[PDB]
Protein backbone atom coordinates (compact mmCIF):
# COMPACT_ATOMS: atom_id res chain seq x y z
CA UNK A 1 0.00 0.00 0.00
CA UNK A 2 1.28 3.57 -1.05
CA UNK A 3 -0.17 6.76 0.82
CA UNK A 4 0.72 9.98 -0.51
CA UNK A 5 0.14 13.42 0.70
CA UNK A 6 -0.26 16.36 -1.55
CA UNK A 7 -0.46 19.60 -0.42
CA UNK A 8 -1.77 22.32 -2.66
CA UNK A 9 0.34 25.18 -1.60
CA UNK A 10 3.81 25.10 -0.47
CA UNK A 11 7.11 27.15 -0.85
CA UNK A 12 7.54 25.59 -4.04
CA UNK A 13 4.19 27.61 -5.25
CA UNK A 14 6.04 30.88 -4.71
CA UNK A 15 8.19 30.02 -8.32
CA UNK A 16 4.91 28.61 -9.56
CA UNK A 17 3.31 31.87 -10.31
CA UNK A 18 2.06 30.87 -13.91
CA UNK A 19 -0.78 32.72 -15.85
CA UNK A 20 -2.86 29.52 -16.09
CA UNK A 21 -5.62 27.35 -13.64
CA UNK A 22 -4.46 26.60 -10.21
CA UNK A 23 -5.04 23.14 -9.37
CA UNK A 24 -3.28 20.24 -7.40
CA UNK A 25 -2.77 16.60 -7.59
CA UNK A 26 -1.29 13.95 -8.86
CA UNK A 27 -1.46 14.78 -12.30
CA UNK A 28 0.73 12.87 -14.02
CA UNK A 29 1.91 8.91 -14.64
CA UNK A 30 2.99 6.94 -11.45
CA UNK A 31 4.95 3.85 -12.51
CA UNK A 32 7.52 1.09 -10.74
CA UNK A 33 11.04 0.72 -12.22
CA UNK A 34 13.14 -2.33 -11.87
CA UNK A 35 16.81 -1.86 -12.40
CA UNK A 36 19.81 -4.42 -11.60
CA UNK A 37 22.22 -3.50 -8.84
CA UNK A 38 24.50 -2.97 -11.62
CA UNK A 39 22.72 -0.03 -13.56
CA UNK A 40 23.01 2.07 -16.01
CA UNK A 41 22.70 5.44 -13.84
CA UNK A 42 23.39 8.31 -16.69
CA UNK A 43 23.78 8.62 -20.54
CA UNK A 44 24.85 11.85 -22.61
CA UNK A 45 24.23 11.84 -26.19
CA UNK A 46 25.70 14.34 -28.32
CA UNK A 47 26.14 14.66 -31.88
CA UNK A 48 29.41 17.09 -33.75
CA UNK A 49 29.90 17.86 -37.46
CA UNK A 50 32.81 18.67 -39.63
CA UNK A 51 32.24 21.86 -41.72
CA UNK A 52 29.45 20.80 -44.50
CA UNK A 53 28.26 18.02 -42.11
CA UNK A 54 29.10 15.29 -44.27
CA UNK A 55 30.55 13.80 -41.26
CA UNK A 56 29.84 13.38 -37.77
CA UNK A 57 31.15 11.62 -34.56
CA UNK A 58 28.19 10.55 -31.88
CA UNK A 59 29.71 10.79 -28.41
CA UNK A 60 27.91 8.60 -25.93
CA UNK A 61 29.03 9.61 -21.97
CA UNK A 62 27.51 6.54 -20.19
CA UNK A 63 27.58 6.63 -16.56
CA UNK A 64 27.07 3.09 -14.03
CA UNK A 65 25.99 2.63 -10.07
CA UNK A 66 27.43 -0.89 -8.31
CA UNK A 67 30.35 -2.66 -7.64
CA UNK A 68 33.02 -1.23 -10.25
CA UNK A 69 34.31 -4.78 -12.19
CA UNK A 70 37.06 -4.91 -15.51
CA UNK A 71 34.59 -7.52 -16.96
CA UNK A 72 32.22 -4.82 -17.31
CA UNK A 73 31.35 -3.03 -20.42
CA UNK A 74 29.47 -0.71 -22.29
CA UNK A 75 28.24 -1.04 -26.07
CA UNK A 76 26.49 1.86 -27.12
CA UNK A 77 25.53 0.96 -31.19
CA UNK A 78 23.16 3.33 -33.46
CA UNK A 79 20.11 1.92 -36.00
CA UNK A 80 18.90 3.59 -38.59
CA UNK A 81 15.91 1.64 -39.22
CA UNK A 82 16.06 -2.03 -39.33
CA UNK A 83 20.18 -1.61 -40.41
CA UNK A 84 23.14 -0.97 -37.55
CA UNK A 85 25.27 2.09 -38.77
CA UNK A 86 27.57 1.98 -35.87
CA UNK A 87 28.86 0.19 -32.76
CA UNK A 88 31.52 0.79 -30.14
CA UNK A 89 32.42 -0.94 -26.83
CA UNK A 90 34.43 -0.23 -24.14
CA UNK A 91 35.57 -0.78 -20.60
CA UNK A 92 34.48 1.70 -17.52
CA UNK A 93 37.04 4.13 -16.83
CA UNK A 94 37.40 7.59 -18.47
CA UNK A 95 40.20 9.60 -18.66
CA UNK A 96 42.40 11.62 -16.54
CA UNK A 97 40.37 14.80 -15.33
CA UNK A 98 42.17 16.14 -12.84
CA UNK A 99 45.31 15.46 -10.06
CA UNK A 100 42.82 12.65 -8.91
CA UNK A 101 42.76 10.82 -11.68
CA UNK A 102 39.45 9.89 -13.77
CA UNK A 103 35.90 8.77 -13.18
CA UNK A 104 36.03 5.48 -12.81
CA UNK A 105 32.37 4.77 -12.98
CA UNK A 106 31.70 6.05 -16.32
CA UNK A 107 32.78 5.97 -20.40
CA UNK A 108 32.38 7.55 -23.43
CA UNK A 109 31.91 5.52 -26.97
CA UNK A 110 32.77 7.55 -30.17
CA UNK A 111 31.20 6.17 -32.98
CA UNK A 112 32.05 7.80 -36.55
CA UNK A 113 28.82 8.44 -39.17
CA UNK A 114 29.54 9.33 -42.63
CA UNK A 115 27.11 11.40 -44.79
CA UNK A 116 24.23 11.33 -41.90
CA UNK A 117 20.92 11.89 -42.15
CA UNK A 118 20.05 15.31 -40.05
CA UNK A 119 17.21 16.03 -38.13
CA UNK A 120 14.99 19.24 -38.29
CA UNK A 121 11.34 19.94 -38.33
CA UNK A 122 10.83 19.86 -41.93
CA UNK A 123 12.50 16.24 -42.34
CA UNK A 124 12.83 14.82 -38.38
CA UNK A 125 15.38 12.17 -39.34
CA UNK A 126 15.85 9.46 -36.31
CA UNK A 127 18.43 7.16 -35.66
CA UNK A 128 18.07 4.65 -32.44
CA UNK A 129 20.97 4.33 -29.93
CA UNK A 130 20.92 1.51 -27.76
CA UNK A 131 22.99 1.65 -24.86
CA UNK A 132 23.87 -2.24 -23.56
CA UNK A 133 25.77 -2.46 -20.07
CA UNK A 134 27.12 -5.58 -20.51
CA UNK A 135 30.51 -8.30 -19.11
CA UNK A 136 32.92 -8.78 -22.12
CA UNK A 137 32.22 -11.98 -22.73
CA UNK A 138 28.75 -11.29 -23.50
CA UNK A 139 26.10 -11.06 -20.86
CA UNK A 140 23.12 -8.39 -21.23
CA UNK A 141 23.01 -6.66 -17.76
CA UNK A 142 20.46 -4.13 -18.82
CA UNK A 143 19.72 -2.11 -21.94
CA UNK A 144 18.79 1.20 -22.32
CA UNK A 145 17.90 3.62 -25.33
CA UNK A 146 17.21 6.35 -27.06
CA UNK A 147 16.04 8.33 -30.54
CA UNK A 148 19.27 10.14 -31.48
CA UNK A 149 18.61 13.43 -34.34
CA UNK A 150 21.86 14.59 -36.07
CA UNK A 151 21.90 18.02 -35.75
CA UNK A 152 23.62 20.81 -34.53
CA UNK A 153 22.07 24.07 -32.94
CA UNK A 154 24.65 27.44 -32.80
CA UNK A 155 24.73 31.36 -33.12
CA UNK A 156 27.10 32.33 -35.12
CA UNK A 157 27.54 35.94 -35.87
CA UNK A 158 24.62 36.98 -34.62
CA UNK A 159 22.40 34.02 -35.93
CA UNK A 160 20.56 30.92 -34.62
CA UNK A 161 21.59 28.74 -36.78
CA UNK A 162 20.76 24.78 -37.75
CA UNK A 163 22.58 22.61 -39.57
CA UNK A 164 24.59 25.59 -40.56
CA UNK A 165 21.57 27.36 -41.83
CA UNK A 166 19.49 30.59 -40.37
CA UNK A 167 16.52 29.36 -38.71
CA UNK A 168 12.77 31.14 -39.25
CA UNK A 169 10.80 29.97 -36.20
CA UNK A 170 7.19 29.83 -37.00
CA UNK A 171 6.35 29.59 -33.18
CA UNK A 172 3.51 28.79 -30.45
CA UNK A 173 3.26 28.83 -26.66
CA UNK A 174 1.49 26.05 -25.63
CA UNK A 175 0.07 25.24 -22.42
CA UNK A 176 -0.80 21.63 -20.74
CA UNK A 177 -4.60 22.04 -20.59
CA UNK A 178 -7.76 19.92 -21.12
CA UNK A 179 -11.18 21.38 -20.74
CA UNK A 180 -12.35 17.70 -19.45
CA UNK A 181 -9.13 16.76 -17.61
CA UNK A 182 -7.32 20.24 -16.39
CA UNK A 183 -3.64 19.72 -16.49
CA UNK A 184 -3.70 15.51 -17.10
CA UNK A 185 -2.27 15.28 -20.82
CA UNK A 186 -3.06 12.25 -23.19
CA UNK A 187 -1.50 11.06 -26.07
CA UNK A 188 -4.46 11.24 -28.44
CA UNK A 189 -4.42 15.24 -27.67
CA UNK A 190 -0.98 16.07 -27.98
CA UNK A 191 -0.75 14.36 -31.25
CA UNK A 192 -4.22 16.17 -31.94
CA UNK A 193 -1.74 19.44 -31.06
CA UNK A 194 0.80 18.82 -32.84
CA UNK A 195 -0.94 17.54 -36.16
CA UNK A 196 -2.76 21.14 -36.16
CA UNK A 197 0.54 22.77 -35.44
CA UNK A 198 2.02 21.20 -38.38
CA UNK A 199 -0.90 21.49 -40.52
CA UNK A 200 -1.21 25.13 -40.04
CA UNK A 201 2.91 25.83 -40.33
CA UNK A 202 4.12 25.81 -37.20
CA UNK A 203 7.59 24.19 -36.88
CA UNK A 204 8.53 25.22 -32.93
CA UNK A 205 6.71 25.45 -29.41
CA UNK A 206 7.75 26.44 -26.19
CA UNK A 207 7.01 25.11 -23.10
CA UNK A 208 5.76 27.32 -21.34
CA UNK A 209 5.96 27.85 -18.79
CA UNK A 210 7.14 24.19 -17.24
CA UNK B 1 38.82 69.78 -51.75
CA UNK B 2 37.43 73.43 -51.60
CA UNK B 3 38.75 76.80 -51.83
CA UNK B 4 40.98 77.14 -48.68
CA UNK B 5 38.63 79.84 -46.92
CA UNK B 6 35.62 77.57 -47.57
CA UNK B 7 37.47 75.87 -43.87
CA UNK B 8 38.13 79.01 -42.24
CA UNK B 9 34.26 80.13 -42.43
CA UNK B 10 33.28 76.62 -41.48
CA UNK B 11 35.77 77.07 -38.68
CA UNK B 12 34.40 80.57 -37.71
CA UNK B 13 30.48 80.23 -38.15
CA UNK B 14 30.29 76.12 -37.07
CA UNK B 15 29.67 73.63 -39.36
CA UNK B 16 31.01 69.76 -39.68
CA UNK B 17 33.22 69.12 -42.42
CA UNK B 18 33.41 66.38 -44.62
CA UNK B 19 36.53 67.05 -46.74
CA UNK B 20 36.57 64.59 -49.71
CA UNK B 21 39.74 64.00 -51.91
CA UNK B 22 39.08 64.55 -55.62
CA UNK B 23 39.52 61.43 -57.26
CA UNK B 24 36.16 60.55 -58.93
CA UNK B 25 35.86 58.01 -61.96
CA UNK B 26 32.32 56.88 -62.53
CA UNK B 27 32.58 56.32 -66.57
CA UNK B 28 35.37 53.83 -66.34
CA UNK B 29 33.79 49.85 -66.89
CA UNK B 30 33.53 48.54 -64.11
CA UNK B 31 34.09 51.51 -61.99
CA UNK B 32 36.82 50.56 -59.96
CA UNK B 33 39.22 49.78 -62.81
CA UNK B 34 41.75 52.16 -62.20
CA UNK B 35 41.23 51.84 -58.35
CA UNK B 36 42.15 48.84 -57.94
CA UNK B 37 44.83 49.28 -60.48
CA UNK B 38 48.69 49.60 -58.99
CA UNK B 39 49.83 52.36 -61.92
CA UNK B 40 47.36 54.60 -60.76
CA UNK B 41 48.13 54.11 -56.91
CA UNK B 42 50.37 57.29 -57.09
CA UNK B 43 47.78 59.88 -59.04
CA UNK B 44 45.42 58.78 -56.59
CA UNK B 45 47.83 58.87 -53.34
CA UNK B 46 48.77 62.51 -54.12
CA UNK B 47 45.04 63.14 -54.24
CA UNK B 48 44.74 62.01 -50.99
CA UNK B 49 48.04 62.96 -49.28
CA UNK B 50 48.01 66.68 -49.97
CA UNK B 51 44.38 66.96 -48.96
CA UNK B 52 45.23 66.48 -45.38
CA UNK B 53 48.67 67.76 -45.05
CA UNK B 54 46.60 70.94 -46.34
CA UNK B 55 43.08 71.01 -44.15
CA UNK B 56 44.27 69.05 -41.22
CA UNK B 57 44.47 71.96 -38.61
CA UNK B 58 40.88 72.58 -39.49
CA UNK B 59 38.30 72.01 -36.71
CA UNK B 60 35.63 72.11 -38.82
CA UNK B 61 37.23 68.97 -40.89
CA UNK B 62 35.51 65.91 -38.97
CA UNK B 63 35.85 63.37 -41.47
CA UNK B 64 37.91 62.42 -44.13
CA UNK B 65 36.62 61.22 -47.53
CA UNK B 66 38.43 59.22 -49.92
CA UNK B 67 36.25 60.49 -52.73
CA UNK B 68 33.17 60.16 -54.88
CA UNK B 69 31.94 56.84 -57.17
CA UNK B 70 35.11 54.99 -57.71
CA UNK B 71 34.02 51.49 -57.22
CA UNK B 72 36.15 50.02 -54.72
CA UNK B 73 39.58 49.13 -55.01
CA UNK B 74 42.97 48.11 -53.72
CA UNK B 75 44.09 51.68 -53.95
CA UNK B 76 41.31 52.82 -51.38
CA UNK B 77 42.13 50.23 -49.02
CA UNK B 78 45.60 51.71 -48.76
CA UNK B 79 45.08 54.93 -49.02
CA UNK B 80 42.64 54.68 -46.04
CA UNK B 81 45.00 53.15 -43.60
CA UNK B 82 47.21 56.09 -44.84
CA UNK B 83 44.91 58.54 -43.07
CA UNK B 84 44.38 56.03 -40.54
CA UNK B 85 48.04 56.36 -39.54
CA UNK B 86 48.80 59.86 -40.05
CA UNK B 87 45.46 61.19 -38.81
CA UNK B 88 43.64 59.32 -35.48
CA UNK B 89 41.66 62.21 -34.95
CA UNK B 90 39.16 61.83 -38.01
CA UNK B 91 37.01 59.22 -39.38
CA UNK B 92 37.57 58.09 -42.66
CA UNK B 93 34.38 57.14 -45.19
CA UNK B 94 34.28 56.26 -48.79
CA UNK B 95 31.13 55.30 -49.96
CA UNK B 96 32.22 53.35 -52.99
CA UNK B 97 32.04 49.26 -53.98
CA UNK B 98 28.62 49.12 -51.42
CA UNK B 99 28.99 51.93 -48.57
CA UNK B 100 30.48 49.47 -46.36
CA UNK B 101 33.49 48.28 -47.40
CA UNK B 102 37.10 47.86 -45.47
CA UNK B 103 38.06 51.69 -47.03
CA UNK B 104 35.05 53.14 -44.81
CA UNK B 105 34.63 53.65 -40.83
CA UNK B 106 30.66 54.82 -41.48
CA UNK B 107 27.96 53.01 -43.88
CA UNK B 108 27.67 55.98 -45.59
CA UNK B 109 25.31 54.85 -48.79
CA UNK B 110 23.75 57.54 -51.15
CA UNK B 111 20.12 57.17 -51.79
CA UNK B 112 19.52 54.06 -49.46
CA UNK B 113 15.89 54.04 -48.39
CA UNK B 114 13.87 53.77 -45.07
CA UNK B 115 12.43 50.64 -45.34
CA UNK B 116 12.97 49.59 -48.57
CA UNK B 117 15.69 47.38 -50.10
CA UNK B 118 17.18 47.99 -53.23
CA UNK B 119 18.67 45.04 -53.64
CA UNK B 120 21.60 45.72 -56.98
CA UNK B 121 23.65 42.73 -57.34
CA UNK B 122 27.26 43.27 -55.72
CA UNK B 123 26.53 46.58 -54.58
CA UNK B 124 22.78 46.49 -52.93
CA UNK B 125 21.17 49.17 -50.87
CA UNK B 126 19.69 47.79 -47.97
CA UNK B 127 16.91 49.68 -46.28
CA UNK B 128 19.10 52.19 -44.13
CA UNK B 129 17.14 50.35 -41.04
CA UNK B 130 17.89 46.33 -42.38
CA UNK B 131 21.74 47.72 -43.27
CA UNK B 132 22.45 48.40 -39.15
CA UNK B 133 21.60 44.94 -37.72
CA UNK B 134 23.06 42.95 -40.80
CA UNK B 135 25.17 39.89 -39.17
CA UNK B 136 28.15 41.25 -37.83
CA UNK B 137 27.49 44.91 -38.63
CA UNK B 138 28.26 47.38 -36.24
CA UNK B 139 29.18 50.68 -37.29
CA UNK B 140 27.37 53.73 -37.61
CA UNK B 141 25.18 54.81 -40.40
CA UNK B 142 25.17 58.53 -42.17
CA UNK B 143 23.91 58.83 -45.90
CA UNK B 144 27.00 60.81 -47.76
CA UNK B 145 24.02 61.46 -50.08
CA UNK B 146 19.95 61.09 -49.84
CA UNK B 147 16.57 62.87 -50.56
CA UNK B 148 18.12 64.17 -54.05
CA UNK B 149 16.03 67.85 -54.63
CA UNK B 150 15.70 67.59 -58.03
CA UNK B 151 13.14 69.63 -59.62
CA UNK B 152 9.99 69.54 -57.58
CA UNK B 153 11.09 66.72 -54.66
CA UNK B 154 11.97 65.47 -51.10
CA UNK B 155 9.25 64.06 -51.13
CA UNK B 156 8.90 61.64 -48.31
CA UNK B 157 12.16 63.51 -46.64
CA UNK B 158 10.15 63.52 -42.78
CA UNK B 159 10.27 59.14 -43.19
CA UNK B 160 14.13 59.82 -43.37
CA UNK B 161 14.28 62.41 -40.13
CA UNK B 162 11.85 59.93 -38.13
CA UNK B 163 13.83 56.97 -38.52
CA UNK B 164 17.03 59.26 -37.68
CA UNK B 165 15.23 60.31 -34.36
CA UNK B 166 14.62 56.69 -33.26
CA UNK B 167 17.22 55.15 -34.28
CA UNK B 168 20.77 55.77 -32.16
CA UNK B 169 23.25 54.01 -35.27
CA UNK B 170 20.90 56.23 -37.68
CA UNK B 171 23.01 59.33 -37.54
CA UNK B 172 21.86 61.39 -40.29
CA UNK B 173 23.13 62.58 -43.67
CA UNK B 174 24.19 65.36 -46.41
CA UNK B 175 20.72 65.79 -48.80
CA UNK B 176 22.07 66.19 -52.37
CA UNK B 177 22.18 69.12 -52.97
CA UNK B 178 22.38 72.37 -52.13
CA UNK B 179 22.44 74.82 -55.25
CA UNK B 180 21.16 73.83 -58.87
CA UNK B 181 24.18 73.69 -61.35
CA UNK B 182 22.68 76.38 -63.81
CA UNK B 183 24.37 79.18 -65.75
CA UNK B 184 23.27 82.36 -67.09
CA UNK B 185 22.48 82.73 -70.53
CA UNK B 186 21.56 86.27 -72.45
CA UNK B 187 18.64 86.03 -75.42
CA UNK B 188 18.75 88.86 -78.45
CA UNK B 189 17.21 91.50 -76.10
CA UNK B 190 19.73 91.08 -73.05
CA UNK B 191 17.48 89.22 -70.94
CA UNK B 192 19.54 86.47 -68.69
CA UNK B 193 17.78 82.81 -68.29
CA UNK B 194 18.85 79.87 -66.48
CA UNK B 195 20.84 77.23 -68.70
CA UNK B 196 21.05 73.51 -68.38
CA UNK B 197 23.03 70.81 -70.11
CA UNK B 198 23.16 71.38 -74.15
CA UNK B 199 22.71 74.78 -74.16
CA UNK B 200 25.75 75.43 -74.75
CA UNK B 201 25.74 73.27 -77.73
CA UNK B 202 27.63 70.64 -75.39
CA UNK B 203 27.04 67.19 -76.77
CA UNK B 204 26.93 64.39 -75.78
CA UNK B 205 24.91 66.12 -72.53
CA UNK B 206 22.68 64.95 -69.48
CA UNK B 207 20.48 68.34 -69.61
CA UNK B 208 18.78 69.37 -66.31
CA UNK B 209 20.65 66.20 -64.34
CA UNK B 210 22.50 69.06 -63.43
CA UNK B 211 20.03 70.57 -61.37
O1 LIG C 1 0.05 35.50 -19.09
C1 LIG C 1 0.36 34.94 -20.36
C2 LIG C 1 1.88 34.80 -20.47
O2 LIG C 1 2.37 33.85 -19.51
C3 LIG C 1 2.50 36.18 -20.27
O3 LIG C 1 3.92 36.10 -20.44
O4 LIG C 1 1.97 37.06 -21.25
C4 LIG C 1 0.55 37.24 -21.19
C5 LIG C 1 -0.11 35.89 -21.45
O5 LIG C 1 -1.54 36.02 -21.47
MG1 LIG D 1 2.91 35.52 -15.86
NA1 LIG E 1 19.95 58.69 -34.56
NA1 LIG F 1 23.39 65.80 -60.74
Given at each position: ??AV???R?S??????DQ???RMSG?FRD?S??????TQ????HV?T????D?S????E???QM???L???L?VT????????Q????TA?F?G?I????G?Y?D???LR??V??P?????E?????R?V????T??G???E??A??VGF?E?????????????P??????????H????????????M??????????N????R???? | ????????L?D?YG???????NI????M?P???L???????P??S???T????????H??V?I???????????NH?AL??????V??S???????????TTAT??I??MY??V???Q??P?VP??????????????R?????????A?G?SLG??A???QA?????R??????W????????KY?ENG?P?SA??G?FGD??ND???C?
Amino acid sequence: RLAVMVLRWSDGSYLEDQDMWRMSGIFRDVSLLHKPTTQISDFHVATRFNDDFSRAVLEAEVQMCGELRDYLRVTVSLWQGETQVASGTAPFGGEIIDERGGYADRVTLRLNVENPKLWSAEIPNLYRAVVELHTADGTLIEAEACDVGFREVRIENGLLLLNGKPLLIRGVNRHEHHPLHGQVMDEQTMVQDILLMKQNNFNAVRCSHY
Amino acid sequence: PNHPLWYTLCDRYGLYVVDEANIETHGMVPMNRLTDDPRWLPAMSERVTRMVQRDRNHPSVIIWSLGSESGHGANHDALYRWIKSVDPSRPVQYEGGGADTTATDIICPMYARVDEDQPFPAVPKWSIKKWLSLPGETRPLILCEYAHAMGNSLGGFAKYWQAFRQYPRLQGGFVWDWVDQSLIKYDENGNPWSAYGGDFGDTPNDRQFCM
